[PDB]
Amino acid sequence: HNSQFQAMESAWRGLKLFVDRTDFRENNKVEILHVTKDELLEDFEFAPETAQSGLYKHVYSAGYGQFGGEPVGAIIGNYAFTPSTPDMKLLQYMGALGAMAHAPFISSVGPEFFGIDSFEELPNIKDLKSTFESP
Amino acid sequence: SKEGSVAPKERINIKYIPATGDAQAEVAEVELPLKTLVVGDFKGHAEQTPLEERATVTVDKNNFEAVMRESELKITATVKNKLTDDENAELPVELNFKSLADFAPDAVASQVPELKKLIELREALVALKGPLGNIPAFRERLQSLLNSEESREKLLAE
Secondary structure, X not given: OOXXXXXXXXXXXXXXXXXXXXXXXXXXXXOOOOOOHHHHHHHHHHOOOHHHOOHHHHHHHHHHOOOOOOXXXXXXXXXXXXXXXXXXXXXXXXHHHHOOOOOOEEOOEOHHHHOOOOHHHOOOOOOOOOOOOOO | OOOOOOOOOOXXXXXXXXXXXXXXOOOOOOOOXXXXXXXXXXXXXXXXXXXXXXXXXXXXXXXXXXXXXXXXEOOOOEEEOOOOOOOOOEEEOOOOEOOHHXXXXXXXXXXXXXXXXXXXXXXXXXXXXXXXXXOOOHHHHHHHHHHOOHHHHHHHOO
């Protein structure tokens, strides 16, 4: 129940829920990449163009952009997105990566994305359309 | 508004940009509805504009309540006064019609101020009949009002 243990248990036992359900005999493979979420935006700040990034090497060129290599279907983002600038700059650089390798980037928003700071008060929101039209 | 693409090359460069579309606007021979023009005196006067400038309004079942309201059928006439003992009395009225229920005597008498006090008289008498026969102590003080004649007439003017 520690913030170092549980966040590194859910990120790893949740992978086992993705390995146990998917039938690998029926033509399925899954690649596992160790990044951290703060490293990844720096890696898009690393290259001057998204077509020379380090994540572009593992999504496009080591997979899809490769003779005979198996191409990438989707990118599981094991992240907790905020609506801040270091998380809208990442998704701007993941939508452009997803439009090059033809693979949608699936991840999740956090409690703080909706502005509630504790998650079980989500049905108490009586107008969620006006929340998204905030500056 | 730019699709993310790759550098072009001897390999093939698939990109997704949706296309403008081809409609080829389809023929539709709509038919002529049997339009009739109901002509005739529909208000209570003669309008001063000549005929070539006034308009025709289209009425169906859904907008008949709006055509009647915007016509402003204002019927002002002098009718006979039968509210008193006078036979040779007359009493003009003022009518404003906005719905089909305004022809009914609930809304005609509501627009006559001499009849607004008579429905209010009846509404005051229907209000009496409920608590009248339930409490038998009302007739006990009718005889007290039969006894106290001075204080009763001072309160009737109020």
